[PDB]
Amino acid sequence: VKKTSWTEEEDRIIYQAHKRLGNRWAEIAKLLPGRTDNAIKNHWNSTMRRKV
């Protein structure tokens, strides 16, 4: 079956950018146009609640 539902690579991208910038989805969202600020923000603060 297809993995989908946020790829492992995308998670690494957001993690790296979040660790350096923070909750600046306004910036991360630019790196991933397909992923809106709301999409990333929600996904992170629900699935990957690892603010560190």
UniProtKB/Swiss-Prot annotation:
* Whole-protein residues included: 142 to 193 of 636
Top-level taxon of origin: Eukaryota
Relate the protein's function as given in its record: Transcriptional activator; DNA-binding protein that specifically recognize the sequence 5'-YAAC[GT]G-3'. Plays an important role in the control of proliferation and differentiation of hematopoietic progenitor cells.
Q: What is this protein called?
A: Transcriptional activator Myb
**Can you say where in the cell this protein is located?**
Nucleus
How it assembles, according to the record, is: Binds to HIPK1. Interacts with HIPK2, MAF, MYBBP1A and NLK.
Comment on protein domains:
Comprised of 3 domains; an N-terminal DNA-binding domain, a centrally located transcriptional activation domain and a C-terminal domain involved in transcriptional repression. C-terminal truncated mutants display increased transactivation.
Q: Where is each HTH myb-type domain found?
A: 2-52
Q: Residue ranges of the DNA-binding region?
A: 25-48
Q: How is it modified after translation?
A: SUMOylated by TRAF7; leading to MYB transcriptional activity inhibition.
